[PDB]
Design a protein around this ligand. Structure first.
Ligand code: HDD
Ligand code: HDD
Ligand code: HDD
Lengths: 726, 726, 308, 83
């Protein structure tokens, strides 16, 4: 009996904001949040309260503090089967991590379409707006191991397992609309080049090293996804504020047998937002779990991640109407040419109970499709289909991984497959083969049809010789990088320049930097000159003369490729640091906290120590974290209320808090005497855009602050931050 | 629809005699045979009728006959995920077989005590006669692989998993009361010596080779178990007709904490019975699944295997009262010194549904004990406790083998162990450690007590130095072999002689045979001389002069050591071949089958072809098998009825049938003209004991037959069989 | 796709200071540095220069840029055994990391005693000041995964494999002289409490969370090693500038049979030095490979780590 | 992968080629070969692109599939000629 008598050890089973209560298993935090998959996992959930401690064979243990020994200072005995079971289980806890996307954070949710899509696909999950499909979603980075950091610069994975009535459909996508390479045969080359180098196993979670840029410099097809990774796309603020994409062209097949080419999209309903590099890199040190934490806490707070599924649709007759090949996974389909049609909404509303069991063991694979979908000859997609089945045999210990509970279909599954390691299902069928007469041939094949039919591949025509050959149509490398470049705002372009410059500065062999710069000069001369200036490299007259690649079907830009060009900000779920002092003006704080609450923006109250402070009117203020404990990296904005400002005015951490938030372009609001902090960040007496200031936190102060927060960062501050020592 | 019109593809769900119906998974054969364990397996039993064939992901298959190819004579495509899933599962079906006992056959059943044993043990499953404990029992050979033959000469295993309310108790025993070696450290050496030799992996399922006899000749502690193996104990007629023994001294612990030394026994209620060597060996070729088939068929017929659990109990103060050490596992406890107290009955009444899932994956381990039981310092048992846990990590793929359905306890199990490969249980406990406050320390330790208490080891006193040394009290090797030899009947002695003679003749290095014969002279001179004479060895003077070892506590024999000295033959479930002709006298056949039915004896009607024959009165008689297809090896007796005997009189197969049965000492009955077959087996006109003959199959002729069958074999016939060419 | 004309792709095979040259595998950076164990690995070392690219079955590859397909825009074919071998190997690269000490950095070296210790031990590797024993050493943190950061606050592992003439001896110690717990039976309890919490798998590489401190508060036996971990011992400057300890009392047994209790120590010849917490924390973000890198580079420079 | 415990089954002595074998594959359970190549990918410059592809030829050439003509639809169908 060790719990505190007041019951404070146990978080409330109701939505609560980040930091208010200790986090908990989903089924304890939100017992009433249910779906058909979550319900189907009940057969394996194991409780604890009121139960006796036992071995795995069910024998009650009397003393879980000691090994059995001959004398209390004697040798441990081999007959101690309780010790050995317990240590054996511990000794074998780990399984191999994923070869790529080893680092990932997952949650349960549900999907529903806005309307029936039966005109274009017979897929059962898209057939009826009242059909709710449970999902399990895992977001990830790519390069680092399962214990690497979250806010690296990398591609992110966005994988969705749909538990449909006609099979599992896994939509296994990323946060950019293309990939680095064209053919799956090169995937181990690419992945080897980006991963830690083989002699010394350095660097973790970083493409900033020689072998990556060597590969890139020798394989220009990589340049398009490289631009995306060097942009702020590679450093998202949150999984909730990035886009998702299937990458490849797939097919929808309707009941009449018509094929339509499709690329899959996820639109974040919380908007697109990313970090800045210095913030992102420092954050990997101050909280390497920042995205995992933020996802889990958003869900515990009721700020459910929501995404709109969307389809870019292209008629079969239009396969050849673009300047790029639809089956080339290094090419995107500009939305200006082919709009995204809204299809439905996904809401992630419950955390797992056990991370290892549900997240670490989940298996996603893009070959897991359902009738109404089909593949194309995209030569990356084609080789993926082999990999995702094969890899589970070692990762998850054999071919029964679909019996691990998180992976199980919720719809019926029956067939003649038997045995394998870890076999859970006990087949009673007299027959293990078909055709059989001894069980009247059950289970039976099902003809294809409009609904509840068998899978039949679309009868695409194949004509050609058996060749190991890249299609000539794939042989164009620069126009899509350039389209991306020209679509970004001036600040976004600066951050891409700085991404390339920072990464190449870490490349130890200078020739590789030169060769990358030469590739940039085939994309855009401004970009290439700007990077070259940062590397102390001078372009040759020949490089200054390379003609830029063509526009993409007449487009010189497409704003949908930018994170920020078209405002789409949303402050719900965001968080503000409030820097307290030992005698806060309580009226200021009442208005601040209520304004924040009205818009669903969270606050963390910070001070130089833990415990409490007392406001002017005697109100007791609980402290969430110290200035050092919860750095400005972890918040979206900073508010300093009035009171005894002299208490913190000379505190180095308090001052640095504002400097760091200032440098990282975050809104800062200063009330009453908190305005003396202006001196620390060098603000003009008459003030500047991005700094909110007033005699008090009343009237328009909080509105002005929330407006800045809706635009995410104060991009206009960029020229001011170069001089600041932070 | 592929099943026949008349429904004859599907066996009736009611008990039926061997061969009347096709055999079937146990839940389909006996759907209403239930126990708590069988019921708890319902969550993983999977049916088949009326379900669609699917992938493992639940996608319906339209065509399970063809791979996806480019054109109907084209190459197979990598995007065929249906083909690859189906082939991947197939490719990974096999798991490592058991290191030893890989060949085994298992069934479900239940156990119930005769009375409360609370005076001597607190084990909950022995606390009350109305407590029914489900069991799963696997019988096995030891040497051969999972694909080897059943009726080899070998020790047999007899492992019972008890699913009790206080934990799984596994009683992991053999069909002899001792083992070959004293100390677990030598187990790999003994097992390597007996297993196929390492250069060429020969012989399978046989100790008859140089390395086994080399080890035995250099390690006289093995001689006791070697006597058992060389007797007819090594060739049981059925798993139903053999004894079981725990081998080791264990302890019972009562509620007061008093310890009593116990050895465990299983007494077969069908009595003890074995084959003879020629018949066993030939049977490994004619039906290598004979025991597996016989067990499965006995249960389907309602001839449930039944065994009485027996305890030999020795007070703690009596540890040193014998002239052998109680902890020496090469020594037996004569029942004349310590009687077997009969404590309960186990009945095996349902076959598995799927052999691989329930039998091959079952894990039995003698370290799996429950409160009320404890270990002793027996140095063979001590090292076993390490092995049976360790070996499961590769065999069953990791430390969650207890989550494999057949292995799961039926009682509660909760603890802080987490992860490992194929983790099924999803833990909701906020804590994964104790002591913890965050879950109020649950699940919690439980103090030992009279019922539902935690496990505490018996506080045995340990005094000595850390040594690798065999106890001097273990250094006596000959007196138990001799006691066993002297307790056998004369024909049992002659079969032991023949077992050593046959085995040693297959040892290629003659000096090994000589060294073994020397060891036999240390046991009994008559035995040593008889085996020497069959090997062409002459005993030396020194050898004729070896003083016999002493009697065991004044015993010059113990008839409980013989299979046959004390009659306990039971005919229920035995089988008779009836050799048909093309016009059987229907009256003979009516009386025969009626009398067999009355005693629960089964019949197989045999002929020179399949189909049916017609009796004199027009009764249509279906044929179960040919003479060659179901040899006399597979039956307990042979009856030849009257009719058109000329039809079979000149059939080599029917004559040989009789010669084979005669040679193997089986009862033979001949009615009316069937007495003309007396010529083939050289029976005088006046008849012989063990040949039943009469003008017709009257009531008397059947009683005579059935009396002979109760005595199992006609031992008096042995001196007539060596003249017989069969 | 080829080396620069000037040979600048390749590190000089001579000792060079950190940053002067790209780092390289040991056998290429320092081909003349040998010891008996390094030489015995020669049977499995595989070179690359001037050799044809092959399958694992030795079949030369003509085109390692493409899958085999039906037409140059067609489906990939199942008969592409080159693609499938390559992808299969890649799909099966990972093995389970170590339950604890998964993050670690290792090097080869050698050991010799100053004088024969035959009076206290018959161990052959301590019997002769001129008999050298090859070693292989791995340093590590405890809590975080193989891809977690180096400069966390944690106990450090210091494991030495001595390849002696009479057997392998592994001296598997840590950088403090004790451990958190008394009986091995509690190891899973302590390790689970310090590791990322089981619902959400947070935090990596840190004891700064509720479960660890819950366990500590309820198990005062932990307080000694906790004091070490909270001190600057928990954040060393380098593996070269920490102490190592075997932790337990072992025995030495001499030829006469006499047993002496012993506790093992390693003294860093580069001296004791640690970071400060703000520095170590921010360094896990600016260079999560800092101790790994600094060990590799010290050895490439000739600043060989030395321990007594 | 299950029978022989992982993708390095070609390093089990009986399975080993007697002719050279070199490539950029790495790791895997019970890895025996210790690779010294600074590169584990191609194309690479840091090891001058070794080990290198070899064109097909009359002897000692790289493997190239015979350029058979393929023509028909993606079908799961038995050839009638097999019936
Ligand atoms: C032929 C190799 C191959 C190729 C070309 C790709 N992948 Fe992949 N991917 C794998 C081979 C692989 C894998 C080895 O099979 C992984 C790691 C382990 C896992 O189960 O699958 C995986 C994991 C993986 C995951 C993590 C799933 C999870 O959360 O568990 C995501 C999100 C993606 N990939 C996304 C992509 C995208 C969008 C690609 C191209 C547009 C891509 N992959 C190409
Ligand atoms: C230390 C080595 C060792 C020792 C000395 C013994 N065993 Fe054992 N036995 C094993 C190590 C082992 C094992 C390797 O752990 C097995 C094989 C696979 C497994 O699951 O357990 C096994 C299997 C096994 C089985 C088969 C259980 C099943 O059906 O799956 C039986 C019946 C026995 N043993 C019985 C005995 C008896 C009665 C022994 C002495 C009285 C004995 N064993 C000594
Ligand atoms: C009973 C469990 C247990 C206990 C009580 C300890 N260890 Fe341990 N340790 C393991 C169980 C373990 C392990 C689980 O067996 C590891 C991880 C995987 C491995 O190969 O060994 C390991 C790894 C491991 C390593 C890393 C070896 C490497 O680099 O690969 C070191 C340095 C230590 N341990 C040091 C210690 C010290 C100084 C301990 C006490 C003073 C200690 N361990 C107690």
């Amino acid at each position: 009996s060790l719990a505190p008598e007041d019951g404070s050890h146990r978080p409330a089973a109701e939505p609560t904001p980040p930091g208010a209560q200790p986090t908990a298993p989903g089924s304890l935090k939100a017992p009433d949040t249910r779906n058909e998959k979550l319900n189907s996992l009940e057969d394996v959930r194991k409780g604890s309260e009121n139960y006796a401690l036992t071995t795995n064979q069910g024998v009650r243990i009397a003393d879980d503090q000691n090994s059995l020994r001959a004398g209390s200072r004697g040798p441990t005995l081999l007959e101690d089967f309780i010790l050995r079971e317990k240590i054996t289980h511990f000794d074998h806890e780990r399984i191999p991590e994923r070869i790529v996307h080893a680092r990932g954070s997952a949650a349960h949710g549900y999907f529903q379409p806005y309307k029936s899509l039966s005109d274009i696909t017979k897929a059962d999950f898209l057939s009826d707006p009242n059909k709710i499909t449970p999902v399990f979603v895992r977001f990830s980075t790519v390069q680092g191991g399962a214990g690497s950091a979250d806010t690296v610069r990398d591609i992110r994975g966005f994988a969705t397992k749909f538990y449909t009535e006609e099979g599992i459909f896994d939509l296994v996508g990323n946060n950019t609309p293309i990939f680095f390479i064209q053919d799956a045969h090169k995937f181990p080359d690419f992945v080897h080049a980006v991963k830690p180098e083989p002699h010394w196993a350095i660097p973790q979670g970083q493409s900033a090293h020689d072998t990556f840029w060597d590969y890139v410099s020798l394989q220009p097809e990589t340049l398009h996804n490289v631009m995306w990774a060097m942009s702020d796309r590679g450093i998202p603020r949150s999984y909730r504020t990035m886009e998702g994409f299937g990458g490849h062209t797939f097919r929808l097949i309707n009941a009449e047998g018509k094929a339509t080419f499709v690329r899959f999209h996820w639109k974040p309903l919380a908007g697109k937002a990313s970090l800045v590099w210095d913030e992102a890199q420092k954050l990997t040190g101050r909280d390497p779990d920042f995205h995992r934490r933020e996802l889990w806490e958003a869900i515990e707070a009721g700020d459910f991640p929501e995404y709109e599924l969307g389809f870019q649709l292209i008629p079969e007759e239009d396969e050849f109407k673009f300047d790029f090949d639809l089956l080339d996974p290094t090419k995107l389909i500009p939305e200006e040419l082919v709009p995204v049609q809204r299809v439905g909404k996904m809401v992630l509303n419950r955390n797992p109970d056990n991370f290892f069991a549900e997240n670490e063991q989940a298996a996603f694979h893009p070959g897991h499709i359902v009738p109404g979908l089909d593949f194309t000859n995209d030569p990356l997609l084609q080789g993926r289909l082999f990999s995702y089945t094969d890899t589970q045999i070692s990762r998850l210990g054999g071919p029964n991984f679909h019996e691990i509970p998180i992976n199980r279909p919720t719809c019926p599954y029956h067939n003649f497959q038997r045995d394998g390691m870890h076999r859970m299902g006990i087949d009673t069928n007299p027959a293990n083969y078909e055709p059989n007469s001894i069980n009247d041939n059950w289970p039976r094949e099902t003809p294809p049809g409009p609904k509840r039919g068998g899978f039949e591949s679309y009868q695409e025509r194949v004509e050609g010789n058996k060749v190991r050959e890249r299609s000539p149509s794939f042989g164009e490398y620069y126009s899509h990088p350039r389209l991306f470049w020209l679509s970004q705002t001036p600040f976004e372009q600066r951050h891409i320049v700085d991404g390339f410059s920072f990464e190449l500065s870490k490349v130890v062999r200078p020739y590789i930097r030169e060769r990358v710069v030469d590739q940039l000069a085939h994309i855009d001369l401004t970009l290439a000159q700007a990077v070259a200036k940062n590397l102390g490299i001078e372009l040759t007259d020949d490089q200054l003369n390379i003609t830029p690649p063509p526009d993409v079907n007449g487009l010189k830009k497409d704003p949908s490729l930018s994170l920020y060009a078209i405002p789409d900000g949303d402050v719900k779920g965001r968080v503000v640091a409030i820097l307290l002092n030992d005698e806060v003006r309580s009226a200021d704080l009442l208005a601040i906290l209520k304004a924040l609450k009205a818009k669903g923006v969270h606050a963390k109250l910070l001070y130089s120590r833990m415990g409490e402070v007392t406001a002017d009117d005697g109100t007791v203020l609980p402290i969430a974290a110290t200035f050092a404990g919860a750095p400005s990296l972890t918040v979206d904005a900073v508010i300093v209320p009035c009171g005894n400002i002299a208490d913190i005015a000379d505190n180095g951490d308090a001052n640095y808090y504002l400097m760091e938030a200032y440098k990282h372009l975050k809104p800062i609001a200063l009330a009453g005497d908190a305005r003396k902090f202006k001196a620390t960040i060098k603000i003009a007496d008459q003030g500047e855009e991005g700094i909110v200031e007033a005699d008090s936190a009343d009237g328009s102060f909080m509105d002005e602050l929330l407006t800045l927060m809706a635009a995410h960062r104060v991009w206009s501050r960029i020229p001011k931050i170069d001089k600041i020592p932070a």
